[PDB]
RNA sequence: AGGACGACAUUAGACGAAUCAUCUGGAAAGAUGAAUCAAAGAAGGUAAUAAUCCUGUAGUCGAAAAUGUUGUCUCUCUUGAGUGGAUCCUGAGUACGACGGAGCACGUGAAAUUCCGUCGGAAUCUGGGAGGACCAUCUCCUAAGGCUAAAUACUCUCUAGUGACCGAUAGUGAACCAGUACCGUGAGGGAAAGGUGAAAAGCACCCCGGAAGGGGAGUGAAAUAGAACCUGAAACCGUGUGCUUACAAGUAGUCAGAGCCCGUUAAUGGGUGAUGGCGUGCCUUUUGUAGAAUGAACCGGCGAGUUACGAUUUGAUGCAAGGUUAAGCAGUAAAUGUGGAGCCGUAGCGAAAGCGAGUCUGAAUAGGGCGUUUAGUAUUUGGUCGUAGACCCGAAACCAGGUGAU
RNA sequence: GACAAUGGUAGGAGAGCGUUCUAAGGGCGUUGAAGCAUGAUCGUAAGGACAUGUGGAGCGCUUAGAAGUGAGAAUGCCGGUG
């Protein structure tokens, strides 16, 4: 059997790069005010997954890209 | 294709239990048993190797230790006296000296009397 | 020599037995060790993701061909039995610069920055 | 070139025809593609019992605890006397395949060595029915030995010990061409290799 | 919408090529010395291994009948095509809506498309549906009636064959009179157990014995193959005896070592061992086990990391700015030839419209993210993961069908 | 030729021994195959030979391929016998 794509990741990575997966970046939903305007203002720009995630995250968006 | 389990097995057993060839009872005729035995007897003899070594050592010193002392010296100071002589022969070479030859062996007594 | 065979050195390796006597007889020691060991591979006891999403996904996207057609001296194109576009879904030209010959190019959107040196040296543009 | 040998004689009728099938020597797609072929030619008919559910069976043997026995299942479990068989053979495929190129440089490679040793080329005749094959092979040749042409029916030798593959030049193999120490072409089917392998 | 003529096929079968001598030997197919056949050197049998000894094989013929099967006559059945349009006709308790469900990969969702229950309930070529809620427009179709081969699935059975599948604890539960001894009220569970020899020549006869069993004599190549019969390991049980042993505290050995006895794969030999030194089995599990923690009475057999398909990585090989086929046909269940749909690569960036060696954010030709400067791809050995029971054995339990108030 | 390193559980890496089957090559075998028994044999190990007795059909060697490939423990299963 082919291995399923995880697809709840999927639809948070964007692969592209040299195999990098790209971003999507945590508190920036609801609930400001309570952050910083400076908290705010960096939370908006995008981060890539990390080394040691993409030890544990590799299968899943193995199909992506 | 299906392996058997075929003769490999005995032929590997009896290697050990003829090994265990002086034991006593079923430590000379079961696998199991015998196994552990000729285990352990190698694991002695690979001690027992150096320790015979020391073993042996000693046993010359005290027949030194008993020759020196019917020239009224003691074993530790023939040995100190032969050092100064220069003399660099070894225990069982001199003991059995003292055993083989009384006249040679009190000549290198004499001669480690003096260089003291 | 079909009896004395030999595989190119650097292929084939015999395969690890686990389990097969006292040169590893084993794999760990307790735990997840079990057979069919879990661990879901991401469920690492607290999310991993759930952190943000963002998507869509719509229709038309084009094939791209760059300027690195040292082809003939001249002719039309589109003609991709030649040894270069295939799996097309449309047909842009791009640049990385060196229209060093001249002929005419046909394929629908070409790029600005390309066009300026296809039509710098034999003109060409089309649908 | 080589000589074209008469059948039966010596009309050495001199041709041209190398390149790929001299020249050209490799050996590590030789062995590659030779088991290639071997793999595919067999059949994984062996599957063996019980993956457990195979086998009659299946009421718990005796309580857990209380017995003093160990805790059995099935009393068809692996361990048992008759019972289930961990990871036996099953059916499966046992064949492969390798890129097309390279299936090529395994025939030039293999007639190539044969190039490098010996192997000869003939005119053709025909008629019926072949004892008279061991005098047309004793015209020198050796132990094993294939021949080709396009065309068939020429093979009433099927029953020579040895030597007794006999194919059109497109039906070629490595097996053969590796497997036997000689072997024998008519022109024309010599040509349509050539056609073929360039 | 049912039946009359002669080709092939199925169900019995026939022909079918070519060897002698010797040595060994119980026996020749083996060895050896000369031969022969071959559209037949597949296989099995024959006193050891046989192309030429037999059954056969390649190949060739063969059917009274019975089905099956078709070519073809008959046999029915046959009426076959176009222009224009006034006013008719093209499937009603239907399509459709609401409600409760259900189904579509699609969990009520924005929910098209499709079906049930229940009340409602249309239109009539100026018509109706569909195109993923819906309206308009446009394009495709024409529901609410029915039948339709082939390509697809399966194997209790038949014939013919195949296997880097088992070879008697394996392989079917079952090589043997197996769903049988056996067990249960029942449903149901369910074994064990193959092998004398080439040939029964299966031991006439004498002998001890009630017999059983045995010593002779015999058949046999062999019964030190004699029936509970090929081989006949180990545990276990015994007979004989070379060295040793009744003042000694021992995980049984190891190191040292006299004495005695023997004489080998002939090598600084073998057996035994007064006596001295040293010395708390193994496995598991543990901070730590001589452990009084666990496991094993012993011996034998059996008994656990596999395969498929995906992923990733390494190594090998082929091509290379390209690399490469899938099904499918062809083929001898191949290899291979075919087949370029397809997939990955040559370009990236952005949620996206989209622009492009650059793009994104941005008001910015500031800065900053990802990318540019160059190598991939196909097969495959290895490692690892994922999907599978996924290294093996083990629950208390749960559900579904049944069987039981003797 | 010197000179260094070489205790080791989980565990990583490496090189190998043997078992059954296949392929090709080259062989042995009723003047006795496998198996079994015995030995004072060889190799660093896994392990390999040779000799003799047994036994009465078969089997190895080289190279490569594939695995139902290796047992001492699971209150493991089955048999036999303490
Ligand atoms: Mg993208
Ligand atoms: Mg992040
Ligand atoms: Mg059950
Ligand atoms: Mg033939
Ligand atoms: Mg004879
Ligand atoms: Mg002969
Ligand atoms: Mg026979
Ligand atoms: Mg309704
Ligand atoms: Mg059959
Ligand atoms: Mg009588
Ligand atoms: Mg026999
Ligand atoms: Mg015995
Ligand atoms: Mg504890
Ligand atoms: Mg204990
Ligand atoms: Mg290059
Ligand atoms: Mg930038
Ligand atoms: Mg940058
Ligand atoms: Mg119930
Ligand atoms: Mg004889
Ligand atoms: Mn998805
Ligand atoms: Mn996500
Ligand atoms: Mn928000
Ligand atoms: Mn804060
Ligand atoms: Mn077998
Ligand atoms: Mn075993
Ligand atoms: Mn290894
Ligand atoms: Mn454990
Ligand atoms: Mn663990
Ligand atoms: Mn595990
Ligand atoms: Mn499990
Ligand atoms: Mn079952
Ligand atoms: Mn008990
Ligand atoms: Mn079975
Ligand atoms: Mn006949
Ligand atoms: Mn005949
Ligand atoms: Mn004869
Ligand atoms: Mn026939
Ligand atoms: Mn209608
Ligand atoms: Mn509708
Ligand atoms: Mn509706
Ligand atoms: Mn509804
Ligand atoms: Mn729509
Ligand atoms: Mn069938
Ligand atoms: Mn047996
Ligand atoms: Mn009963
Ligand atoms: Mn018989
Ligand atoms: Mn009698
Ligand atoms: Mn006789
Ligand atoms: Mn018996
Ligand atoms: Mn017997
Ligand atoms: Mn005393
Ligand atoms: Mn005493
Ligand atoms: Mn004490
Ligand atoms: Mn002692
Ligand atoms: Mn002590
Ligand atoms: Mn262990
Ligand atoms: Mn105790
Ligand atoms: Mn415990
Ligand atoms: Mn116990
Ligand atoms: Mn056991
Ligand atoms: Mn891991
Ligand atoms: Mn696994
Ligand atoms: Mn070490
Ligand atoms: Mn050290
Ligand atoms: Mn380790
Ligand atoms: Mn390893
Ligand atoms: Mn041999
Ligand atoms: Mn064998
Ligand atoms: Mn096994
Ligand atoms: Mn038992």
Same mark, same amino acid.
């Given at each position: 059997?082919?291995?399923?794509? &995880? ?22 939903? &609801? ?35 | 294709?299906? @392996? ?28 199991? @048993? +015998?196994?552990?035995? @000729? ?27 008993? +020759? +020196? ?28 000296? +003292? ?9 290198? @007594? ?7 | ?127 | ?83 289930? =068989? ?96 000689? =072997? ?15």
């Amino acid at each position: 059997p082919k291995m399923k794509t &995880h697809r709840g990741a999927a639809k948070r990575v964007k692969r592209t790069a040299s195999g990098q997966l790209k971003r999507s970046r945590a508190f920036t939903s &609801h609930l400001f005010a309570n952050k910083s305007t400076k908290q705010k203002r960096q939370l908006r720009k995008a981060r890539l997954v990390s080394k040691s995630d993409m030890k544990r995250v590799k299968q899943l968006l193995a199909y992506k890209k | 294709p299906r @392996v058997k389990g075929g003769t490999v097995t005995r032929a590997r057993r009896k290697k050990t239990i003829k090994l265990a060839k002086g034991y006593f009872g079923s430590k000379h005729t079961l696998y199991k @048993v +015998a196994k552990q035995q @000729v285990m352990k007897s190698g694991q002695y003899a690979f001690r027992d190797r150096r320790q015979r070594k020391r073993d042996f050592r000693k046993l010359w010193i005290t027949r030194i230790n008993a +020759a +020196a002392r019917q020239h009224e010296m003691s074993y530790s100071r023939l040995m100190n006296g032969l050092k100064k002589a220069g003399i660099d022969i070894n225990r069982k070479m001199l003991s059995e000296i +003292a055993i083989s030859d009384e006249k040679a062996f009190a000549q290198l @007594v004499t001669k480690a009397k003096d260089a003291l | 020599k079909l009896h004395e065979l030999k595989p190119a050195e650097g292929s084939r390796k015999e395969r690890n037995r686990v389990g097969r006597g006292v040169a590893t007889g084993n794999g760990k020691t307790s735990g997840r060790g079990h057979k069919g060991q879990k661990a879901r591979s991401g469920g690492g006891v607290r999310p991993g993701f759930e952190g943000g999403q963002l998507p869509l996904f719509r229709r038309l996207p084009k094939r791209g061909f760059t300027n690195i057609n040292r082809k003939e001296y001249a002719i039309v194109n589109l003609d991709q039995l030649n040894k270069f576009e295939d799996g097309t879904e449309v047909t842009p030209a791009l640049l990385v610069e060196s229209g060093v010959v001249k002929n005419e190019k046909s394929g629908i959107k070409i790029l600005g920055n390309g066009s300026l040196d296809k039509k710098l040296t034999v003109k060409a543009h089309k649908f | 070139y080589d000589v074209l040998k008469l059948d039966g004689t010596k009309s050495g009728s001199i041709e041209l025809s190398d390149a790929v099938f001299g020249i050209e020597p490799n050996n590590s797609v030789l062995f590659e593609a030779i088991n290639l072929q071997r793999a595919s030619l067999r059949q994984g008919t062996h599957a063996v019992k019980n993956r457990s559910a195979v086998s009659g069976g299946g009421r718990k043997p005796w309580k857990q605890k209380g017995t003093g026995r160990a805790r059995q299942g099935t009393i068809r479990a692996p361990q048992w006397r008759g019972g289930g =068989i961990v990871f036996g053979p099953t059916p499966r495929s046992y064949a492969y395949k390798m890129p097309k190129k390279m299936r090529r440089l395994a025939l030039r490679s293999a007639l190539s060595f044969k190039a490098q040793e010996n192997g000869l080329t003939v005119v053709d005749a025909f008629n019926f029915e072949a004892p008279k094959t061991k005098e047309f092979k004793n015209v020198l040749s050796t132990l094993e030995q294939p021949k080709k042409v396009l065309v068939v029916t020429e093979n009433e030798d099927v029953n020579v010990e040895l030597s007794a593959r006999n194919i059109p030049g497109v039906q070629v193999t490595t097996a053969q061409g590796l497997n036997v120490l000689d =072997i024998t072409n008519a022109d024309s089917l010599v040509i349509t290799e050539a056609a073929a392998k360039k």
